[PDB]
Structures are given as C-alpha cells and as structure tokens.
DNA sequence: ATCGTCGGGGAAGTTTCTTCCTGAGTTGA
DNA sequence: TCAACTCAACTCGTTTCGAGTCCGACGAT
C-alpha cells in the first residue's frame, strides 16, 4: 500500500493506492486534500494512520516553506514502524513554472478512471491549484518507475 | 518518573537522565553523557533517547535557522502516540550572548551537581568540555524547578 | 585682548584670532585657521589653542550628547589655571532649520570678511568648505560686539 | 608621593588623600572628606583637588550618562599643564552582584582602615555613612597595590 | 523631560570613541 | 560535512519555526 503526499501549509494532499509490483495491478483507494493548520502534528498523524501505509512518498523542498518540518516529523513518526518513508527530489518546478495544466489534466483524464471507477465523483466536487497534481504525480511516477 | 533532557546539536549532542521521585520531589542523577550524531543521525537519536525508556524528554528551543530544528520534529514524531512526552523549553540561560552563557552554564553546573550525583569528581575529571552536559543538566533542572 | 573664537568638532575644527582694543573698541582680525583633532584630540587641542596665546577663548555651547561637550570641558579645565578666560556663548545663529544656520553663517561671513582682512580671495580658495571658519569668525565678532553694552 | 583618589559625582563627591613614602612602601592616610559640588562645581573641584598638592589623581571611569564624565575631562584639562598624572581606572570590583558591589567594597574598607591612620578616634566618631568614602578609599588602595 | 523612531555582540587603549576580536548562523562546493 | 564569509535583543504559540513583543539609545524639541 503506497501513500503519496504533497506537503505544504498551502494545501496538503495525500493519495492512497495499492500497487501489485511488476504485475500492473493498480488500485486507487483514495485521494484527498486535507488541512494541516489546526493541530497540524495531530492532524498529520490522524491522516497518515487512516489506511496504515507501507511507503510514504514526499517531495523534497528547501527552506522555501515550513513544510520541511512536516517531512522530518513524518520521518520520525514512521521510523521504527514497518513503513518506510522516502523523499524524492523535486521534478516539480524545472525551468518554467507554467507547465502544470498539460501533465496534470493529461495524466488525470488518462489514468484515474481505470483504478477507482469514481473518476468524476471526485472531479465534480474537487478543484484546487497544485495539490492533487503534486501528490498524484509523485505517486504515479513512483509506481510507473517501480 | 525518568527525565531525559537533551542539549541538541549534530556535532556535540548531550543528555542528562534524572530520576524525580513522584510526590517526593527527590532529584537523583541517573546518568549524564554526551554522544555524537554524525553518521545516520536518526539511528543515534533513537538509540540515545530510548536508552533509559524515559517519561519526559526535554529539548531546548532554537530559532528558525539551525539544523537543530530538524532534530526537534524528528524526536516529536518519534515519541508521538507514546507515554513519553517531548517538551520544547525556552533557553534556560538567555542573558549574555557568549561570555555569560557558556561560563554561567558551566559555573551553575559545577556548583549544583554535588547534591545530585555523589560522583562529582569522576564526571568533572573526564570531559573538560562541559558546555554541553552543563546545558543538558541546566535544562533538566530548570524543568524540574518548573514542576513544583 | 587677544581673542580666540573656536568652532569645535573632531573632524574639522576651526578658529579665528582677533585683537580687541580695550580702550578703542576696535576689531582686528589676525588669523583664521582650520585644524584636525581626529587623532590625540587633547594634545591637538592644547597645541592649537596655545598657538597664539590668547587672553579670551570663546566656545559655542554644545549639547551633552556629543563629543564636543567633552572637548568643551577639557578646555574649561585646561585654561582654568590662569590668564585665559574661557567663555561659552549661546549659538549666535539660532533658530530655523539646521541648514539655514550654515548658509546664513557662510553668507554673513563672505559679505563681512572684506572689511577685516583685505585678503578675501586667499580664504575662499584655500579650505573651500566655509562653514566652520564662518562659525568661528561670527562667534568672535558677536562676542566683541556684545562687549560694548 | 601624595595620592588623591576621588569618588566623583554631583550627588556626594568624596576624596581620600594618602601619603606614600617612596622606596619604603609606607602608606599614610592624610585625609578623607565628603565634599559638595553643587554651586559652581568647577571652583569647588579645583579647590578640593589643589587642597593637598598631589602627584597622581585617581578617578573611576564612568559611562556617558552622568556629568561625572564632564568632571573627569575637567580634571584632565586642569592637571594637563604639568606636575600631575591623572589616571582613570575602571571601577575595581567588576564582578558579582551590584548589591554586593557595596558589600565587598565596605568589607575591604573596614578590613584595612585601621592600619593606616593611627588617629582613628575622630574618624571612628565622625561619620555613620560610608558608601562614598569607602569607594574612594578602595579605588586609592587598589592603585596603591598596583603601584609596586 | 518628552514624543517619535530605531537597533539590539564584547574588551581593551589608539579611551566615553576606535579598533579590534569573538563565536554562532549561512552558503556554496 | 566543511571551510570561508558575515555579523550580533527576546519569544510565544502568535492551537509550538515564523510573526509578535520589550527595553535601552538617538533626534528634535
């Protein structure tokens, strides 16, 4: 069970998948944009223990945002536990910054439907800038490169 | 009631382990040591903090610009959902910048150690670089003073 | 009366040396000089002020939040021995903006020097900044004008 | 040589006049007084300093917060001519508490006052207050120890 | 003194300002 | 990590990493 997280005080988001390795049996369990402003450490632990994951995928950031403190908190929380937290270098923000639309809507409209069967169920009531894109793209890139 | 107060730092981290007798207000020094968190610092932090299975972990607050902050949240996440509360206390000595901070720390240490360990000479004779174990001891003792 | 009026300051101190006739009430400008007190100011003050051993030394009142006050009190102690009266006058040019003092000072200086030196041009060329020698000249001349009563 | 140590202040200035026998290290206290510099402080200062013709005058350095600095520079200009060495020493007891600054001062005072005058009758019966003449005497004695 | 505004290290000698020297961030390799 | 370079207050949640406060210097009356 794979859990990919877009970290940030802006709009944190997480996606929970189950991927059968090398078998191309992808199952999307959930995708959500949460809020980590009220009791953020308690809220982070509560959101991470919902569907106890085996791997957590994060985007590495510099000093740009306090979201790094969430990265180190997550590393400490799941350290001895069975899960393994891995922080991937930022693909995101390479050269230009006006390249979201293409990859976001393309990968969504192409690949969300075959895994959850609730494509438009989330589309009709979710709309945000750079949370579902970062989280889903990190998770899907890890799974495709897996 | 096992107290573990830590002076944080990647180069010279230090920790003091006290025993506070509940309802008796009895301070008994269990141990005081310093370690190194250079190679795979997460393993070293976890081991040094779980060494004596404490009930409270005391850390000293740093500003928003230091690697010591990264250790703070790792420890907070590590001991979260446990019967071991990590608390981040303000800097005990917050007066003089350099000449008063370290010297006042090691002075109050050398003066207040005698009533707690009964092994004063053996600890003073080893290190001679006291300004980390001194900070940890002062942090722990300040937390205990704030207990009553 | 050999009179020495001083515009005080570490960076560019200045002084004007006059001769005042006691029974004629006539002004005579002897000299006007800039100096430097940026290094060893007590030695420099003692040297520059005793250069033309005066009978009166006039200083301009300074506030307490300036090094000119310590120079004032050093001079007070120095000449408190004999033969030299140190007198501290209120700033002659007073009021309005601070820069209005400088321009008014150098203006009255430029327009009133000709009647005293006959070497007006040598002073305008050497030491082009005029806002210290003006202060010293105006201080001395104001004291001597206030001497009649 | 005749040594004159001054506790400066418009509040209650004080001075101690010692006589040091040259090459014998014999300290003899000539006088101790609490003067007043209220009206025409320059005249009063000059009178009090020229009362006993000294060879050195010892002052305690002050911060630029009080007219005592103007008195210091007045003294420097006054004795600058010749014959005198005005020395401005920092306040001797540069340590511990401020409330203990007077305690140790008057302690060293009461410790060493008896051995210097041999006419301590009028002086013992004279005054019930110390916290100015004590400071002046301690400054003077510190210079006397720093003399050899 | 008094209201508005600003900066926030220590020690010693060239002394009440200047000239240093600390010892911790912080920053690119 | 690490070695050169730059530069000095505290501090509380401000639902606990950054935006808030406090306390002595100047400037101009």
Author numbering:
A (entry chain D): 2 to 147
B (entry chain B), D (entry chain C): 1 to 148
C (entry chain A): 1 to 149
Which sentences from the paper describe this structure?
The DNA resolvases orthologous to the A22 protein of vaccinia virus play an essential role in poxviral replication, by resolving HJ structures formed at the inverted repeat junctions in a concatemer of linear genomic DNAs. The 150-residue Fpr protein has the characteristic architecture of enzymes from the retrovirus integrase/RNase H superfamily, comprising a single layer of β-sheet sandwiched between α-helices.
Eventually, the Holliday junction HJ8/5, which has two 5 bp arms covalently closed with -TTT- hairpins and 8 bp arms with blunt ends, gave crystals that diffracted to ~3.3 Å resolution. Unexpectedly, the crystal structure of the Fpr-HJ8/5 complex reveals that the HJ is in a H-stacked conformation, where arms 1 and 4 (as well as arms 2 and 3) of HJ8/5 stack on each other to form a pseudo-continuous double-helix. In the Fpr-HJ8/5 complex crystal lattice, an asymmetric unit contains one DNA Holliday junction and two copies of Fpr dimers (4:1 Fpr monomer: HJ ratio). These interactions are formed with various structural motifs from different regions of the HJ-DNA: TTT hairpin-loop, the crossover junction, and double-stranded DNA. This interaction includes DNA backbone contacts by Trp41, Pro67, Lys70, and Tyr73, as well as electrostatic and van der Waals contacts with a flipped-out thymine base by Phe64, Ser69, and Ile72. At the center of HJ-DNA, the N-terminus of the αC helix and the preceding loop (between β5 and αC) contact the crossover junction, with a stretch of residues Ser97-Tyr98-Arg99 at the apex positioned over the DNA minor groove.
